[PDB]
Amino acid sequence: MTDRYSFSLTTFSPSGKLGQIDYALTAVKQGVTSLGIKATNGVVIATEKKSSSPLAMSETLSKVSLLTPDIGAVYSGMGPDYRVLVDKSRKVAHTSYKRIYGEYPPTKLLVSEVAKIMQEATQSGGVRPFGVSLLIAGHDEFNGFSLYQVDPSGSYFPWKATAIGKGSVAAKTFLEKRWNDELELEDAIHIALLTLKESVEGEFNGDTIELAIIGDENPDKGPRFRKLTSQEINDRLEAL
Amino acid sequence: SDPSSINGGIVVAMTGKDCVAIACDLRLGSQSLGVSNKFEKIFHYGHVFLGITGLATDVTTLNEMFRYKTNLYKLKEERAIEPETFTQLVSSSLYERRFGPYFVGPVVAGINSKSGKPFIAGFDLIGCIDEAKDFIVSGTASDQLFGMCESLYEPNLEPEDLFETISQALLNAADRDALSGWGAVVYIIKKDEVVKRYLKMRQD
Amino acid sequence: TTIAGVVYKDGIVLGADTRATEGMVVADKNCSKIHFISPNIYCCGAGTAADTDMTTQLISSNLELHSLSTGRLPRVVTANRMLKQMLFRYQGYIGAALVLGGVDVTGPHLYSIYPHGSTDKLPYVTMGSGSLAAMAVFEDKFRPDMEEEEAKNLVSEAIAAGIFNDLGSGGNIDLCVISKNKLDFLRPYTVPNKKGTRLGRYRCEKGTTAVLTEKITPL
Amino acid sequence: TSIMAVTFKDGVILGADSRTTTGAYIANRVTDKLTRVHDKIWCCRSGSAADTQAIADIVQYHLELYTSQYGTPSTETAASVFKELCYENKDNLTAGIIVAGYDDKNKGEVYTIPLGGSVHKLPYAIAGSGSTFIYGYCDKNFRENMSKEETVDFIKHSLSQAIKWDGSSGGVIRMVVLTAAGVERLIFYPDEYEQL
Amino acid sequence: NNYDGDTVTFSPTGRLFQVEYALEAIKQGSVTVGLRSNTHAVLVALKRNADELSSYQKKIIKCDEHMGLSLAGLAPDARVLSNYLRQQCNYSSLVFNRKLAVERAGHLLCDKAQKNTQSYGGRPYGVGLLIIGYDKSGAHLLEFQPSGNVTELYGTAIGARSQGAKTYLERTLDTFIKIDGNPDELIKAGVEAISQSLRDESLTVDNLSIAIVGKDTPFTIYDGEAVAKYI
């Protein structure tokens, strides 16, 4: 055992394309739809719990993850790749930030750190890029509420609202029509549930949808991240 | 031999009503020999002020180190560091040399730009935080300053009342210390103006 | 310092004084010595204060990451292990002397952790320079399976013993009551000494200090 | 500290006082110095509490991992792991450990590991500061193939004396019985043993 | 074919082509013969010159007072392996005050050669060795192949046209094994054996190299006019 792969597995092709990044993006395209919408007093992130079997307990599989008390993440693409990015995002939020400054990182900086990790898989020796795109929603004192997308390349962009994966083209058009700068958090949740219904084939309820918010503090502060319960989603599906 | 009392000198910081004050003497010596009467011990990174007593090479090094760190902090965060955050940064930075420490006695002073709350803090040489509202003292005449501050101080002083309190605390403490004095500086810090005053004191 | 803990019927009561000393001088009269480890676990700290702070913070941080990955509340034994194995590794050079108390899935647990990496699992413990004063109160009056307000009084009484009789200890009494149903962080629980009242005003009048030069810069 | 392990007909019994002192201060008067490294392999600890705790935890780990792979370890194997740690780290340790365990093949076995890190297999073993005072007594009163009640009494009397004379020892006498029948914990309070 | 790019790749019939190509380098090397009795062990080696101005490449290397080898193939690899034997012989003497057993020497050479055949980046050794020695169990002769296969024999030969010498020894087996307490007659049998592998060229004074080890004979090499006696 020598890890002999000390050379890049992502290289520029004659056209200027980085093949593996493009192919990672194709993997993201095949993944289940997830979306994010930013309101004035909160952010919402949502995705479909595409259950691989009905015998599987889909509650045990969390697609929406808490990164810090005020930051949450969702993805489209390869689940195992997402899981290890969440682990590293949680850890880096302590090592390179909380243990130094005594507070959690702001959304943009935690995003930047995740982006860095993904960029390094795009240039380091003997690795493929991550096969996920992340949607990171968060709050911090000086920047307020924010929503970011992070792609396999390591590129990130802040969004008012967006979607990624399967039905993203259609979903983004849907969001463009509905979004305005005066949405309350409940209005954004309502729009998220509408937008997500289009890309979902089968059952559409609190058990098959995962949806979280970055909003008010839930009681040194309380955490702004909150994952909506199966019941809380179903309540809003009656007013749909 | 004792690194914390080769070069000498003192820093004191106080809170007031919508203001903080931090002050230091100007002496640098080699024990008995006075060398410099222009060795200031208070620095600032944005609106956060940091006094440092102790071994002068470490005072200089830590200033340069916190300038470095707060500059990168600002570039990344797109805002100036706050006193509360900086205090934690100082503590971290000191404790990472736990078993080969900087022989210093740092003192943070500033006003939180968002909340407006006056803030001071002190540390031992390995970064334990003294987080006191009233006053923070440091240096070779720290005992002297503790006494002066405890009897002179009272809460919610107006900027120019506070000036007289911190100045007299510094001056009279310094004059009972062989290794402090040779001049003094007092910063009066408010939410959006800072007044720096050099004091007239005995030059022995 | 005087720090103590007891195991009572429903859980744990931790106690601490508030005097932070540099040598013989008192730097802070209201210093917090009861530290957060996790939501169900707290740590009273004595010995070298920086070591106590940073050791509890590091293990609190690592337990937070552990608890995010497992999705369940951390245990006192894992806090105990992580503190213990670190302190042992450093052979006493990290002068952290902790009273660790918390409530698990397995019930309430109380530990004393020493700088060298030994730990005792006990129904009551005391540490710091006021441990003997505090322990006298526990040997006098402790019984197993106390009610909450009784245990609170006993710990408070034990900290008080340290405050008065030990010079290293002083200020206020902080408690932390941990049970399955709640966490009560009582700071301060008691103020056994009034701050001394000063009879004169020694503050100088404006223009008393002699200034050489002045500079004003706006922000 | 006063500790002992004694083999008898049906297996082995470990015994210990409960006092842990910091100089003349009794830091813990109800210490459990009988620690479990496997189902029916236990040890008596003397020396640095930090060191003997750290060792006993590492041993428990090694025997847990041994058991995962190769099934129940022998008492000899447990003693060998203790020894390996104590001997290889003799310069940084102060540990005097008695290892006692029950196999069905071998029955009761007692191994003592003194400061050097040497191993000695014995019918019974005594150790700790309070052991000096009972070499005479234990040598005169020990017999092989005692009954459970005789061995409980032998340990009770012996540690009673060790406690009486040694200021570093005291509190309750804990015992752990290791037989085919299982694991039994016994405790004996001052009011019982002092009047012997 | 596709499976000969490196040593780490088995062919579809379970062959290691790089090892077989290394084996080929030996066949291209000059002939050398080994043989022994109960008292002595002999190496005979036909040295090869580049041209008439050049020297004749040395084939025999001494490993200890009681052991040494003859080489056929890449001479630098023989130097590496002989140096390794010298060290192992030396380590045995220094640490255990013990002359290294010839059988154990073979085992060590085998395992050294093996590591080069299972790992990426390296290459097999491109040389064959005939190790003679006299140890506590009498005279010994070994044949080393860079595959790793070491083999204890009464007599053998390796290199170009070595089959002729090897057949001769196979016939002479019952005669030369009995040449006890007579070094010169054992060398004669070795010189006669190596002669069966000659074509066109014959054994001249600076062509022939002979070595011997035995009961009361340290490993000594004979070159030049020392071997004229046997021509």
Place this chain on the structure above:
Amino acid sequence: GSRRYDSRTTIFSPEGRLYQVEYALESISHAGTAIGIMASDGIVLAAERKVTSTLLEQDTSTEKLYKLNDKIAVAVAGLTADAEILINTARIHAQNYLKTYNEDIPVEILVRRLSDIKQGYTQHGGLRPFGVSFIYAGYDDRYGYQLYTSNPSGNYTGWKAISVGANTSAAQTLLQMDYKDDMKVDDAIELALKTLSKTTDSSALTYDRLEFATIRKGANDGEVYQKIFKPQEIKDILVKTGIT
């Protein structure tokens, strides 16, 4: 072994070109155009964002213009993630220099450092180069206002005006036509926007598709000020110059 899969990123072609550098430059040619223009009294950085949707949060967005210290900024063309790796390295070099000499790093020294890092990826390590070209806009008290560019090869050069990314050929001709040495910042602002307006592959140049910045000594008491333009300010300067 592994050799089979090795692209060999650090080799010459038979013509004496570095394949990966050339292909990285091809990558960069598709990136949004960035322009730097140096005047006598300041520098202008202008850059075109790419793809954009109406839903992109522009005011908190930074893909083109980055701050290295208070005196030096960069405009990016290429992989934004690759740039941010290099940017954080540069930001450290400036502070290491400041800590060592107690003076702000000279612009060229920083530029050489980054450019030397890029070079290293082309000569050793077997890794792909950084798919990034920088325009460096900076000031120091030796040379005053300076523009540089670097590219994946690690080569850097100094400029009076320059473009990188898309349509550089067209952009450089238009700059070469209208640039003059006595020009001022307000004029260079106008030239930069006019050049982008003609070379853009979009239908029209609007505020939401631009990042814009100026480094002026034009401050009170002769001190250098970096101004990263806000979305509303870019919209105002577009109206002022008469493009919208």
Place this chain on the structure above:
Amino acid sequence: TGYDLSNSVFSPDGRNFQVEYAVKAVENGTTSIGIKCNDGVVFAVEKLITSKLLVPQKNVKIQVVDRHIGCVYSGLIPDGRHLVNRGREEAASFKKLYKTPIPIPAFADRLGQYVQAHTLYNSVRPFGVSTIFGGVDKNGAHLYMLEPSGSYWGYKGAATGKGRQSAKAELEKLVDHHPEGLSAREAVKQAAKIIYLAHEDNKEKDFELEISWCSLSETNGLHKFVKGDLLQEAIDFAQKEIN
């Protein structure tokens, strides 16, 4: 295609062709066997006499590990030696820590994990040997056989090499005709016969029989080579059965 050019590559089947190619080297080797008896194990191997110049009884193939384990293998002989060297390191580190000599199942997995490790990367070649090994431990006798993939199982009898089918058929008869078990001295005789019968697949060249054994009664649970009279008695029994 190209899936067989690199070790540790899954073909579209889910196979590692390089390992299967290693098996071909094993199948190419000489016949080796193992027989589990009442209180021990017997190992035997076919040693092809390539030439008259080979010294008889000198080129020993069966290797001892620790003092209680015997190993024999078919295929690339150096690869087998490399594996036994590792086995000796494993058995040594086990005894150093745990005092007791390594149990056979424990030892089997040590070899198993190591051989399997050489199917995890393209920088190493798989082992070109099937290894038959075993001995006596505290739980009695154990016989194992370990393939290039890292696969191993416990066996009543085992056989590998060119004459494995012949041998296997013979081993299966013994298992059927002796459910109560085979004695150690019987197993030595039977081992000799089975190598002699399995020699029909390598019939061109003549061969040399080598046998070893661990038995609780016959060798005190230690690995010993069958030598002299007992070896000749087993050869005579084998020669009688072929005629």
Place this chain on the structure above:
Amino acid sequence: GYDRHITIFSPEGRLYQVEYAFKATNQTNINSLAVRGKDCTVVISQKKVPDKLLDPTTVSYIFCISRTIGMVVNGPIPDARNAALRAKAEAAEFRYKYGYDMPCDVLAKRMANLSQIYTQRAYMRPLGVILTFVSVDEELGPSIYKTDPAGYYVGYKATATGPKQQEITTNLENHFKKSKIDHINEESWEKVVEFAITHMIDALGTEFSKNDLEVGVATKDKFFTLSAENIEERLVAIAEQ
């Protein structure tokens, strides 16, 4: 086409080596099943001893990882043992560092995160195995967690693995559709094993003797495998009703 030899993306966004490792999974031709009772978790697996020379006691794909955790493997034995040894090592290290027994799901996630690494790093191949972990967790109760070569993992009410997994899965799905509960409502593990075996017989359409099965049972504070005679008693009870 080297995108099929190592773990890099194909143009479709696929990792062919991961997919081919999944195919290696069925190379044993063994079907496993896992179900949960009230107090227990039962895992059963087919046992096939094709060679008469094999010692049938040593032919096992069920592993005792810790005292509380059992692991059945669907895939070749060398990779199964690779995974077993690591899972044991991880479970022991966990208990040492954190002072309590490694939970079933935490181990599963740990093994899954390791499996993920082999799908991203080129020098390491995936293991050709699916790992089904079982325990009676002290917090979560009866637990079934499964890991595969992709590095995916999830908790199960019940599961099945192997060539005929779909038949077993649907058989189980249909039973839980009737009962409308996440478990086998049964007090004794003995009857939960009887259920597991019965529903495998129905799904596969094959009868079993005592030597055709291999059974693992997790209870509170221990996991254990049943002997041939314990299984025979189980089979007798099934036949008698």
